Symmetry: C3
Amino acid sequence: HAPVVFTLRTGIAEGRMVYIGVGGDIDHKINPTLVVHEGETVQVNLVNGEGAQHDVVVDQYAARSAIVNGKNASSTFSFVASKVGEFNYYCSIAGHRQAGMEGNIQVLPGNRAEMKSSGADITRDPADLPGPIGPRQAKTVRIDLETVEVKGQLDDNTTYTYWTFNGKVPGPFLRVRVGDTVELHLKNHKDSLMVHSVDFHGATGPGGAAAFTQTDPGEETVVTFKALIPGIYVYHCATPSVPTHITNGMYGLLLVEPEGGLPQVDREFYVMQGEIYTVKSFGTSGEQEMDYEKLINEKPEYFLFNGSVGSLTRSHPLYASVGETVRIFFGVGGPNFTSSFHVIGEIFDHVYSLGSVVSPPLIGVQTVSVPPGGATIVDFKIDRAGRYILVDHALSRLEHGLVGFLNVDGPKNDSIMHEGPA
Amino acid sequence: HAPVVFTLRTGIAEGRMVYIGVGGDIDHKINPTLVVHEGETVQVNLVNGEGAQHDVVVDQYAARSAIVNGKNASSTFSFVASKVGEFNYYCSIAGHRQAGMEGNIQVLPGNRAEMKSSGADITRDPADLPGPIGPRQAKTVRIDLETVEVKGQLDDNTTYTYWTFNGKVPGPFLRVRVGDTVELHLKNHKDSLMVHSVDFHGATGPGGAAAFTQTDPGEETVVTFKALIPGIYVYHCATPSVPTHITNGMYGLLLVEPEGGLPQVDREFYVMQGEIYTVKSFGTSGEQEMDYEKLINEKPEYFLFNGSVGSLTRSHPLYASVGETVRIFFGVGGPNFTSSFHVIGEIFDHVYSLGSVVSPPLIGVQTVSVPPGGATIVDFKIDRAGRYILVDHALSRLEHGLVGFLNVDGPKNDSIMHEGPA
Amino acid sequence: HAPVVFTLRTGIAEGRMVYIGVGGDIDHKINPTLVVHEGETVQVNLVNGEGAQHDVVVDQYAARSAIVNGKNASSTFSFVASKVGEFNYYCSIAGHRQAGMEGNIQVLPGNRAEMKSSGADITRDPADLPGPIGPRQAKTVRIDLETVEVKGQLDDNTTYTYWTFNGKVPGPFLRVRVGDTVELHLKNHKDSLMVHSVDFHGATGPGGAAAFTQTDPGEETVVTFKALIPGIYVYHCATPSVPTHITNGMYGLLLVEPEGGLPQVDREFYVMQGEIYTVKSFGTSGEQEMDYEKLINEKPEYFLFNGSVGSLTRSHPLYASVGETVRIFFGVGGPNFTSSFHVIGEIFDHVYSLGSVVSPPLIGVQTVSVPPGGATIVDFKIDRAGRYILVDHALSRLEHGLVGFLNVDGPKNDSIMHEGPA
Ligand SMILES: [Cu+2]
Ligand SMILES: [Cu+2]
Ligand SMILES: [Cu+2]
Ligand SMILES: [Cu+2]
Ligand SMILES: [Cu+2]
Ligand SMILES: [Cu+2]
Ligand SMILES: [Cu+2]
Ligand SMILES: [Cu+2]
Ligand SMILES: [Cu+2]
Ligand SMILES: [K+]
Ligand SMILES: [K+]
Ligand SMILES: [K+]
């Protein structure tokens, strides 16, 4: 999977100069044992706590941080845990290892256990969308949405109150044809504390339907609307506080197909990015709560593909085969951040700028900016095997949970890319 | 209009466990009375101050926050104040109401009073722009700007020292034809403390004219420059500190029309987005001042359309009628934030990407990313009535002042969108 | 060149009411002497420290700040230091000058000394790139990169440990033709602490080559890959922590030319933007260190073109002649911020949107958003003389080191732009 990340701050604790764990399974632990599995890439973040000179050296891997001099000075490093066994990490500054700066890394055989928590799985499988529509004539299409507030899994051993369409994040991928009439039935579950609604960016009229869909707990609201313009549209709850309903999970995509349909492709995926603003820092376990000051001042703790940490890496990666042309419908619920959407190891053959399905897509593009409340379509042929990586290329976000895998099976070496000279 | 928002934090004050108001008319008040008008959507933000378990419950409205457990934990909720009267809000956790956590919501008949302050109205009416140039050959054209420093209204009961072109924000919409020779006369009002100037993105040469227009208070500067390339351009003061002059209000748009003009439209509108960085938190009344730390580190307090809170909702909303084709000239003065410009309930028929007027517009677009120092043009046919909502879809900005209304009269229900089934 | 900036906070120090220097050569100095050279533009930022009313008045220049009233209230102003000599600056509030609020501005003849420090010059000269490839057929091209960790100059009297391709930032501009087979040899210098590697956005396959290029210090890695799709591609180090390797300087551009080559142009330039996250605030001299909290929370201290403060203003400005058509290859290493790239005084004739070289470029564009992990190409005819200014139009970044000069010699006044009436 992604690197396993450990943060260590230096300090004086239990009477000695030591390292102290930050977050994860090591939170506030003195000289924590870092437990890792054979073959994992292990990342260690060292932050200087008290202002003495420090590093971290990993005894048999010859991996080390840079030296860190003043308070807050930091160094980050990694190594592949290729050998099972127990290995010391320690500070190499004169006297510090003797003063107390030493702990263990345990490299265990086997695979890391699956993520678990007391929360429900609220992730949307990225293969979970309707396929292309027929060559139909326009018609009336009934859509059902239910709004549910649910304790969900946010990360291993970490939970959060999500608010969702149909129990997952993003909500259902809706797919209709230009000219269709949509008849929406919105039910707000009876255990909901809040009113919920929906605004479709592909709808024309008051609140994008939100003026007709403010729905009390236990009740239903119904609204009919015409789909007048093809495009790939975000939709989201539109009940005040709107950025609050959105951060909690109430966002989705609505595709309005052009008359002829989109170009035919072998496989399509559904991916949306959002932020969560928790009182505790990213990586702290337990029951997380929303922090309003962080929300309104745009200070996110979690950045997420499809609802959760590890959603598209461990829970349900994308899977395709070599030679397939693939399409990702990519949307940004937000509420706030522009995504720089990129698939590492591949190139977008076509990018539907700003979600326009009528204009000719752009050709041969590495990375696309997608604003919150915006969506695009990217298509590309997969020429060869590999683990391709979905990222927002504001790469600090990798460490706030933002990473997905597109797994394509086949040989490591081929004529498109291979080790060694030509 | 837009929800009336109240922030309550919990804590201990006057010898009891209580709610304490934050900002607005309730700042620092204990168990404050929330005064509200019939028909308003009321939003309450609860932030846990001291770490006991809390909620807010509105007696008779069946409206409540989620329970908030640790310090900083937060819950936002809203409700429509449909019934006139006096209603209790209280904490439902055992003992907390008797302990002192209770206040009153007064729902008054009629409408909320207008916004007032000891500041001048510095807002640009969105219909305040010159219309299409006729068919003309290119000619010499005189433009007059005056830089004025003025105490303006920022919000209800709140003021700020604005720096402006001609006393409003954005400055005058300038409109010339490609090939025009522009003779710009820039006067700095004698009462200004600062020198002021102007850089047009549509100008070719030193500082986009800024090298020629550094103008001492009481002086006049004159520069002539040719408009070589059609487009929709931002202009702004360019005297150091340029971000300071921009945040204070010194930005506007220059349209350089292409040869046959832009497509004819029923109505054109002029809107610009910018930020203000105050010492005090958004929503705190009184005389506001610039915070330089917040400016250079991009931590805004106010995000604004046309200069002021309520600028395009209560002061000068956009007006149009059903069936009209409408144009928005939309620019970001900034200084720093890219806008995700979106009109809730409508779809952009045409988007002039990156403000290009020569390249073919994109078709059928929900949301347009516009950088600081950039502008765009969006055109759309308004198919039906409703109140349409201009926003930056980084939606936390909603609750920092960034919202606008485009009001279109007519029935709620029609064939394009109506309540109930098809 | 760019404004000389001094920051003063007010306070009580050494027993009086005074101004105190913040950063630069005045840091923590009481009533500091601001030393400046004839003809420089001087900017003073005044920040209220203790809460009494203050301003700053420059004697004889008649330049002053606005009055600042509460703690943190700020006001910036500037003046041109046109007269050599010594001039008092003082607070005009009653009693404050006698209470101690007074210092000196020393305006010296001649030019400011060149930036110096104990660090290596790590800046890429923007003219340092290979020119257009012949109209040859596809072939095998060898590329060599070495990854080196080096103490570099960040600013005058300030250094940082940069991690680089080939000792400069950005790395070498790489230039191949679509269809080429690229044989990349990556050497990691034996004095490196870290493994380093390479991900090319122009490569197709595992990690964009990163799966094949994790290189221990003192070792080499070789990988061959085909350039399948023309485009302007970012490449960067891809060893965990990736945003750490990127912020330290490991980013560059790879052009995969289309079959015909790019349109012919008179002069090409190579510019990249990135951020540095130091423990100390921007403008603090000395040996700087990375701050991981600032990195991962996206709170930068330096925004940089080509590696360093003053890199494109004083060290290696861009130079061209009137009449030339100029091309800038512009990319954002990041790791985090999208750039609003603009050349003050010019307009882009052609913008290759999202870095697509297959799609028709956009025409007549003032400013372009470039995401981190993305690049574009902008072409423009320079019609007349002037000092043109490359900026990211999120203009607070000017004060964080983000500015560049394009120098075009010739007359100040002409038909395109001149002082006085038409
Ligand atoms: Cu140590
Ligand atoms: Cu909702
Ligand atoms: Cu929306
Ligand atoms: Cu309580
Ligand atoms: Cu000005
Ligand atoms: Cu500008
Ligand atoms: Cu004073
Ligand atoms: Cu590296
Ligand atoms: Cu990348
Ligand atoms: K491909
Ligand atoms: K419409
Ligand atoms: K030009």
